[PDB]
Design a protein around this ligand. Structure first.
Ligand SMILES: COC(=O)N[C@H](C(=O)N[C@@H](Cc1ccccc1)[C@@H](O)CN(Cc1ccc(-c2ccccn2)cc1)NC(=O)[C@@H](NC(=O)OC)C(C)(C)C)C(C)(C)C
Ligand SMILES: Cc1ccccc1CC(C)(C)NC[C@H](O)c1ccc(O)c2c1OCC(=O)N2
Lengths: 53, 339, 340, 281, 229
C-alpha cells in the first residue's frame, strides 16, 4: 500500500507548471546580483564601521 | 549493430546478443539482453531454458546461477522489448523469443590469473558463461549438440573523480630512525591509465646520526584473491633502483617515474590479468572498486595496487645495529582504463 | 502481484514524466550564464571572535533576527546565548537531555528551542517573569530523534526528525497541527523560506523535498544526490536552495526550474558536507566540511572564494546574520569561531 | 691553535640548536589552540626553563671558555651563575613534574582529570619554579655559597665556581638527586603498569618490547647527560685533587645538551607534529 | 549608561562563566557510556543492574540506551564518540535464529568500522549464558552448524576451569567469543580494543566488571598517548 501513497505524492508533482532553466537562471543571477551592494561578507570591510573589528 | 550470433550446433537454437563487454561503472550494470532463436519444429522437450553462471575456476566452484524459461511466454515478467530487441524480433522472424538477465551486484570483475607454462589447458579465474539449452526437466544433462555457451565479461572503467593526492610520513624505528629522520613521499593523482607512467617525489631529510643507503622504489599488486574462505597475495609489478648519495643533513628531493608494463612480468605466476575471451594477449589487471567504498565485503577476486618506498641504512657495527632497521611507506592508487 | 506490478509501472511512467520535465529545461546551463561576472575577490575571512565557553562538541546554531545574539547547543547539556559583538554570555540553559542536535532562535527574539535524541523539542521562554529561563512547553515529539527545528513565528514551529517525517507544531497547544510524511530515511535538516510559507527538508534518502505548510503537499522533490543530504538552506530570494551531501557535493536546486543548477566539487575534496548557508545576496554560498575546513563557494563560478581554518574537527554548524554582517562557524572542538 | 677554533664552532652550533628547538616548541604551543593541554602546560614550562638558559647562559659560558677572563664584572658573574643554577634546576624539576604527571595519569586514571586541572597545574608549576628560585638566586646573589677563592672573588676578572660543601650538597640533592629518585620510582611504576597491560592484551587478544624503546629515551638521555656531572660535583666537593677544572667543565657541557634534546624527547607525537609541520610555511 | 550596560553584561558573563566552570568540574569526573543491543538481545537487566546514572567506587558512570534503533544506526552514532566505552549486548542463545547472531556480528562490525567510532573501544557482553547452556545441553539444534564457520575452531587452548561446565558448551563459547574477536583484530588501530566478557540472567557482578574495563580503557588510552605502548 506504500506505492499507493507514492503515486498520490507523485500526482501532486505531476501537474506542475515549471519554467525553463534559461529564464530561471537569468532571473536568479540578475535579481540576486542587483540586490548585492550590501553584502559585507563579500567586499570586506565596507568602512571603518566594521562592527566585529 | 553487428549482433554476435553463435549458431548452436545441429542447425538449431541460435542465440543472439548485443555488446559482450557489459559495464559496471561503480554500481549497477547493463542487463544481459538479447534474443534467442528457437525453431519450434521438434518440441520434444517443450521447454527451452537459458542460464547465466558466474563460475570460478582453478572444478567450477560457481558463484551465482540464474535460470530463465522462455519457450512459454512466462507471463510473470513484462520486460520491455529492448532497443536492439525491437529490430531483432523483426530480423530473426517468427521464432525470435527474447531473454534478459538482470544481474544485481553479485560477482567481481572477470579477472583471469596468469597461467603457468606447461600449466595451462583452460582459463583460470572469474568468467561468465551464459549457457543455453532445451530440456523438458530442470536439471537433466543436455550437453551433446543443442548446448551453447557465450563468454561475456564485466569490466569497470575510470570514474570521474581524480581523488586527493596520496601522502604518507614515517618518523622512527628500531635503532635506525633515531635523530630526526622522516620521509615525505607523495604522489601526483589517484587515477592512472594503463601504460602511462606514474611519478613519485621524495623529501627525505636525514638529520640522523647515521648514514642511509640508496632507496628502492617498487610497485606492489595487492591481489586479494580466494574462493574457499579467504587469502591474500602480493606480487611485484615494477621496480626501480636509485643512487647511493644521501649524506647526513642532506634533504634529497629527487623525483622518479615508474611505468608498470607487462612486457617484463610475463613469467610471474599469480599475476592477475584482465578478462580473456579465448587465451588472448590481454593487458594488466585493472584495480576494482572495493564494494563502493562502503561495505568492504567480497566473495571473489579483488585486485588493488600500491607503491612502496624502501630505505636502506647499511648499519655499521655492534651498537645494537643488527635489527629491524628499514623504514618504508605505502601509497595506494587506482590504475584503470579511461572512458 | 498484479497490483504491485501496476503500481511499479505507473511509478516508472511518473518518473519518466518527471525526468522529461527536468530535462526540458535545457535551453542552457550555468556555463553560458557564467560569463560577464567578475571573479570574486579572494575571500580570506579572519576570525574576529572566538567564543570559548562550551565543554562538549557543538552541533547547531542560529543567529537572532537582531544579528547580535547567537544560540548554540552542546552535548554538555548547555545551550548558551552568546553576544557576538562583545563575545560574552547572556544565558546558559541546562538541558534535561545531554544530547541535542538542534537549536533555534525565535524571529521576535522571545523564545529559544532545542532538541535531540530525547525526542523532545523543548521550548524556552527568554522573557521570563523575574528569573532564569524556564522550559515553556516541551513538545510531544515524534517517533524518531529530532534533527533540526526552526521557528515559523513565536506561536508556530516546524521540527524535523529521524522518523522520516517532519511536522509543523503549535506551541500554544503543544500538539501537531499537521505532519509531513513521504520520505524514506531519516530527515537530517530543514530550512524555512523568506516568505515563511514553504520549507524543504533533505533526508537520508538523498532527496530534498519541498513542503507546503498549508496542507502538507510535497510539491516538488529535488533529487539528484548519491549520498544523504546533511544540510540545506534557502536562497535569499526564496527561489532556490543548496543541499550539501556526504558525497562532497553542494548541488543547488531551483524551485521554478525544478532540477539541479550546479554540482559543487573540486576533484580533491573527499569528505562530505556538514552545513550550508548563503550570504545576503547568495553569491557566497558557504559550506562546512568533515575535514575541519570550510570552503566558500561562489554561487555562479563554482570555484572557492577562500578556505576557512581553525577548528580541528568537523564544523557541524554554519550561519549568516539576517543582515549578512558576518558568518559564524562551530565545530566539535567546543569553540565557536566568528568569521567576519 | 685548532682546539680553540674547533670548540668555537661547536659551541655556537649547540647554542643555536637548543635555542631554535625550544623556541620552535614554544611557538608550536602558542600557535594552535589545540596544543593547550594540562600536560602541555608542564611541557611549556620545561621549554621556557630550557630556553631562557639557551640565550642567557650558554653564550656567556661559551664566552668564558673561549676567553677565560670574565670582563662582564663581579656582579654579572654572580647573576650568570644564579640563572645557570635556576635554569638547570628548573629543567630537572620540570622533568620530574612531567614524569609524576604521567605516573598519576596511569596509577590514578579515574582521578587524574579532576585532580590535575588548569589551576592545579599552574600552582604546581609556580611552586616548582619558586623552589628553583629559592636555591639558585637567593644563595648565589646573597653569598651563602662562599678560602682559595677568597682572593678570586675579590679579583674582578675570574668567575670560577668555588661552592662550599654545604651549598654543594644542598643544591645537588635539591636539583638532581631527589628528582632522580622521584623519576626512577615513577617510571618503575609506569613500566610495571605497561607490562601488566601488555600481559592482559596477550592473554585476551593474543594471536617489554615497546615499553623499553620509550623508557630508554625518556629515562636514560637525561641520565647520561646529567648524572656524571652531578656525581663529579660530589667527588670534587668531598675530596679535592680528584677531578680537574677542564673535566668538570666538559661534564657540565655534556649535561647542557639534554635541555636541547628534550623537545625531541617530549614532543615527537603526531598531534603536536602536525602543528609543527604547519609552521613550515 | 552605555558603560553601565557593558558592566552589567560583563557581570552576567562572569556569573555564567562561574556557573559553567562548576558544570565543567562535575562533567569531567563523569564518564559516558553507550548501552547497546539488538532489540530483544537481552539488554534488560543490564540497563537496571534512558539515563542510568550510577556511581561505583566513588566514580560516576551513566549509560544511554539508544531507544528503538529503527535503521541507519550511523545517524546517532556521530554523537556517541565522547563516551569511554560502548556496552554492547549480544544474544548468545540465538544461534538457531534470520540468524540473529549473524545480524549481531554484522552490526558489531558496523559499529567497529565507523570512522567516527574508530577510537572508541567497545565492551562486549555475551548474555543468556544460562540459556546458552540450556540450549546446548540437549543439542536438538545443531551446536553451531547454522553458523557453518565452526569447522576447525575446536580448542583455542584457552583454559576455562570454571566448575559446573560442559566441554561442548566451552567450545561453543570460545567460538562465539572469537566470532567478535576476529572482527576486533581485523582493524589494528591500537586505540580502541575489544573486551569480550561473559554475563548471565543472574550476574550480580557487572557493576564491577564495567568499572574494571573502563579503567583498562583509560589506562590504555593514556599509554598510547605517552608512547609507552
Ligand atoms: C626521537 O629520537 C630522539 O630524540 N633520540 C635522540 C637519540 O637518542 N640519539 C642517539 C643516542 C643519544 C641519546 C642521548 C644523548 C645523545 C645521543 C641515537 O643516534 C643512538 N640510539 C642508540 C642508543 C641506545 C641506548 C642508549 C642509552 C643507553 C643508556 C642510557 C640512555 N640511553 C642511547 C642510544 N639510537 C636509537 O635508535 C634509539 N636510542 C636509544 O636510546 O635506544 C634505546 C631510539 C630510536 C630508541 C631512540 C636524542 C634524544 C639524542 C635527540
Ligand atoms: C661557573 C662555572 C665554572 C666552571 C664550570 C661550570 C660553571 C657553571 C656552573 C658550575 C655554575 N653551572 C652550574 C651547574 O650546572 C649546577 C647545576 C645544578 C646544581 O644544583 C648545581 C650546579 O653547580 C654545582 C652546585 O653546587 N649545584
Amino acid at each position: 500500500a506504500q506505492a499507493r501513497k507514492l503515486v498520490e505524492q507523485l500526482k501532486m508533482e505531476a501537474n506542475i507548471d515549471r519554467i525553463k532553466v534559461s529564464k530561471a537562471a537569468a532571473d536568479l543571477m540578475a535579481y540576486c546580483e542587483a540586490h548585492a551592494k550590501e553584502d559585507p561578507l563579500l567586499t570586506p570591510v565596507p568602512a571603518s564601521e566594521n562592527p566585529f573589528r | 549493430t553487428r549482433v554476435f550470433k553463435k549458431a548452436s550446433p545441429n542447425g538449431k537454437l541460435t542465440v543472439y546478443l548485443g555488446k559482450r563487454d557489459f559495464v559496471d561503472h561503480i554500481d549497477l550494470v547493463d542487463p544481459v539482453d538479447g534474443v534467442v532463436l528457437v525453431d519450434p519444429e521438434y518440441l520434444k522437450e517443450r521447454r527451452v531454458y537459458v542460464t547465466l553462471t558466474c563460475a570460478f575456476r582453478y572444478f567450477r566452484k560457481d558463484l551465482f546461477v540464474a535460470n530463465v524459461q522462455s519457450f512459454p511466454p512466462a507471463p510473470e515478467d513484462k520486460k520491455p522489448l529492448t532497443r536492439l530487441q525491437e529490430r531483432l524480433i523483426k530480423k530473426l522472424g517468427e521464432h525470435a523469443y527474447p531473454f534478459t538477465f538482470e544481474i544485481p551486484p553479485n560477482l567481481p570483475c572477470s579477472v583471469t590469473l596468469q597461467p603457468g607454462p606447461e600449466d595451462t589447458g583452460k582459463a583460470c579465474g572469474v568468467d561468465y558463461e551464459v549457457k543455453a539449452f532445451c530440456a523438458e526437466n530442470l536439471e537433466e544433462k543436455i550437453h551433446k549438440r543443442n548446448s551453447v555457451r557465450l563468454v561475456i565479461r564485466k569490466v569497470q572503467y575510470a570514474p570521474e573523480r581524480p581523488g586527493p593526492q596520496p601522502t604518507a610520513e614515517t618518523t622512527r624505528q628500531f635503532l635506525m630512525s633515531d635523530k630526526p629522520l622522516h620521509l615525505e613521499a607523495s604522489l601526483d593523482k589517484e587515477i592512472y591509465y594503463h601504460g602511462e607512467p606514474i611519478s613519485v617525489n621524495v623529501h627525505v631529510t636525514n638529520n640522523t646520526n647515521k648514514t642511509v643507503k640508496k632507496i628502492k622504489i617498487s610497485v606492489r599488486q595487492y591481489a586479494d584473491i580466494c574462493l574457499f574462505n579467504t587469502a591474500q597475495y602480493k606480487c611485484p609489478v615494477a621496480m626501480e633502483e636509485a643512487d647511493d648519495t644521501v649524506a647526513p643533513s642532506s634533504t634529497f628531493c629527487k623525483v622518479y617515474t615508474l611505468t608498470p608494463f607487462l612486457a617484463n612480468n610475463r613469467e610471474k605466476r599469480g599475476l592477475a590479468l584482465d578478462g580473456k575471451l579465448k587465451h588472448e594477449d590481454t593487458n594488466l589487471a585493472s584495480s576494482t572498486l572495493l564494494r563502493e567504498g562502503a561495505n568492504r565485503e567480497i566473495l571473489g577476486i579483488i585486485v588493488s595496487y600500491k607503491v612502496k618506498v624502501k630505505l636502506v641504512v647499511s648499519r655499521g657495527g655492534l651498537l645494537g645495529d643488527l635489527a629491524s632497521s628499514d623504514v618504508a611507506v605505502e601509497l595506494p592508487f587506482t590504475l584503470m582504463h579511461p572512458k | 502481484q498484479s497490483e504491485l506490478d501496476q503500481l511499479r509501472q505507473e511509478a516508472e511512467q511518473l518518473k519518466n514524466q518527471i525526468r522529461d520535465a527536468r530535462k526540458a529545461c535545457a535551453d542552457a546551463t550555468l556555463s553560458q550564464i557564467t560569463n560577464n561576472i567578475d571573479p570574486v575577490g579572494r575571500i580570506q575571512m579572519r576570525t574576529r571572535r572566538t567564543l570559548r565557553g562550551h565543554l562538549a562538541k557543538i552541533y547547531a546554531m542560529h543567529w537572532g533576527t537582531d544579528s547580535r545574539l547567537l544560540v548554540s547547543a552542546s552535548q554538555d547539556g548547555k545551550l548558551i546565548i552568546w553576544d557576538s559583538y562583545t563575545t560574552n554570555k547572556v544565558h546558559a540553559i541546562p538541558l534535561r537531555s545531554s544530547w541535542v542536535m538542534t537549536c533555534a532562535y525565535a524571529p521576535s527574539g522571545n523564545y529559544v528551542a532545542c532538541g535531540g535524541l530525547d525526542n523532545i523539542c523543548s521550548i524556552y521562554n527568554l522573557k521570563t517573569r523575574e528569573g532564569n529561563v524556564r522550559v515553556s512547553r516541551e513538545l510531544a515529539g515524534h517517533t524518531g530523534y529530532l534533527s533540526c527545528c526552526r521557528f515559523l513565528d513565536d506561536n508556530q514551529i516546524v521540527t524535523s526528525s529521524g522518523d522520516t517525517t517532519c511536522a509543523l507544531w503549535d506551541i500554544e497547544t503543544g500538539q501537531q497541527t499537521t505532519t509531513f510524511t513521504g520520505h524514506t530515511g531519516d530527515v537530517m535538516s530543514l530550512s524555512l523560506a523568506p516568505d515563511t510559507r514553504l520549507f524543504v527538508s533533505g533526508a537520508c534518502d538523498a532527496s530534498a523535498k519541498l513542503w507546503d505548510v498549508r496542507e502538507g503537499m510535497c510539491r516538488q522533490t529535488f533529487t539528484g544526490h548519491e549520498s544523504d543530504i546533511n544540510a540545506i538552506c534557502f536562497f535569499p530570494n526564496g527561489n532556490a536552495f543548496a543541499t550539501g551531501s556526504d558525497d562532497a557535493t553542494c548541488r543547488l536546486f531551483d524551485l521554478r526550474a525544478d532540477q539541479e543548477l550546479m554540482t559543487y566539487s573540486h576533484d580533491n575534496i573527499i569528505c562530505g558536507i556538514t552545513s550550508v548557508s548563503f550570504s545576503k545576496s547568495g553569491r557566497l554560498l558557504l559550506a562546512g566540511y568533515d575535514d575541519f575546513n570550510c570552503n566558500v563557494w561562489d554561487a555562479l563560478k563554482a570555484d572557492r572564494a577562500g578556505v576557512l581554518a581553525g577548528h580541528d574537527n568537523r564544523v557541524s554548524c554554519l550561519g549568516v546574520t539576517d543582515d549578512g554582517m558576518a558568518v559564524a562557524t562551530g565545530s566539535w572542538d567546543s569553540f565557536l569561531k566568528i568569521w567576519n | 691553535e685548532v682546539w680553540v677554533v674547533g670548540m668555537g664552532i661547536v659551541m655556537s652550533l649547540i647554542v643555536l640548536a637548543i635555542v631554535f628547538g625550544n623556541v620552535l616548541v614554544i611557538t608550536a604551543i602558542a600557535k594552535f589552540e589545540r596544543l593547550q593541554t594540562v600536560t602541555n602546560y608542564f611541557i611549556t614550562s620545561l621549554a621556557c626553563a630550557d630556553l631562557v638558559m639557551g640565550l642567557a647562559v650558554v653564550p656567556f659560558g661559551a664566552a668564558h671558555i673561549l676567553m677565560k677572563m670574565w670582563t662582564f664584572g663581579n656582579f654579572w658573574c654572580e647573576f650568570w651563575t644564579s640563572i645557570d643554577v635556576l635554569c638547570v634546576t628548573a629543567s630537572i624539576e620540570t622533568l620530574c613534574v612531567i614524569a609524576v604527571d604521567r605516573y598519576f595519569a596511569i596509577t590514578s586514571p579515574f582521578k587524574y582529570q579532576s585532580l590535575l586541572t588548569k589551576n592545579k597545574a599552574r600552582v604546581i608549576i609556580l611552586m616548582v619554579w619558586i623552589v628553583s628560585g629559592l636555591t639558585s638566586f637567593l644563595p648565589i646573589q646573597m653569598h651563602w655559597y662562599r678560602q682559595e677563592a677568597i682572593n678570586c672573588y675579590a679579583n674582578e676578572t675570574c668567575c670560577d665556581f668555588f661552592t662550599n660543601q654545604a651549598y654543594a650538597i644542598a643544591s645537588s640533592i635539591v636539583s638532581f638527586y631527589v628528582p632522580l629518585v622521584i623519576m626512577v620510582f615513577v617510571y618503575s611504576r609506569v613500566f610495571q603498569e605497561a607490562k601488566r597491560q601488555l600481559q592482559k592484551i596477550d592473554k585476551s587478544e593474543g594471536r617489554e618490547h615497546k615499553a623499553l624503546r620509550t623508557l630508554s629515551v625518556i629515562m636514560g638521555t637525561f641520565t647520561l647527560c646529567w648524572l656524571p656531572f652531578f656525581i663529579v660535583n660530589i667527588v670534587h666537593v668531598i675530596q679535592d685533587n680528584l677531578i680537574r677544572k677542564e673535566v668538570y667543565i666538559l661534564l657540565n657541557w655534556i649535561g647542557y645538551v639534554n635541555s636541547g634534546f628534550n623537545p625531541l624527547i617530549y614532543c615527537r607525537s603526531p598531534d603536536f607534529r602536525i602543528a609543527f609541520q604547519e609552521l613550515l610555511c | 549608561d552605555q558603560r553601565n550596560e557593558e558592566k552589567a553584561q560583563r557581570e552576567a558573563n562572569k556569573k555564567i562563566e562561574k556557573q559553567l566552570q562548576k558544570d565543567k568540574q562535575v562533567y569531567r569526573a563523569t564518564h559516558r557510556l553507550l548501552l547497546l543491543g539488538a532489540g530483544e538481545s537481552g539488554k534488560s537487566t543490564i540497563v537496571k543492574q534512558f539515563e542510568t546514572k550510577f556511581q561505583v567506587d566513588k566514580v560516576n558512570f551513566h549509560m544511554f540506551d539508544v531507544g528503538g534503533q529503527r535503521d541507519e544506526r550511523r545517524k546517532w552514532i556521530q554523537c556517541f564518540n565522547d563516551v569511554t566505552a560502548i556496552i554492547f549486548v549480544v544474544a548468545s542463545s540465538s544461534y538457531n535464529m534470520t540468524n540473529r547472531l549473524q545480524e549481531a556480528l554484522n552490526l558489531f562490525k558496523s559499529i567497529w568500522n565507523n570512522r567516527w567510532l574508530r577510537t572508541i573501544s567497545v565492551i562486549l557482553f555475551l548474555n543468556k549464558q544460562d540459556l546458552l547452556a540450556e540450549k546446548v545441553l540437549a543439542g536438538k539444534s545443531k551446536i553451531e552448524d547454522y553458523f557453518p564457520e565452526f569447522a576447525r575452531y575446536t580448542t583455542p587452548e584457552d583454559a576455562t576451569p570454571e566448575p559446573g561446565e560442559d566441554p561442548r558448551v566451552t567450545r561453543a563459547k570460545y567460538f562465539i567469543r572469537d566470532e567478535f574477536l576476529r572482527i576486533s583484530t581485523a582493524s589494528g588501530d591500537g586505540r580502541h580494543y575489544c573486551y569480550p566478557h561473559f554475563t548471565c540472567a543472574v550476574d550480580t557482578e557487572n557493576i564491577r566488571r564495567v568499572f574494571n574495563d573502563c579503567r583498562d580503557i583509560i589506562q590504555r588510552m593514556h599509554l598510547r598517548q605517552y608512547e609507552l605502548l
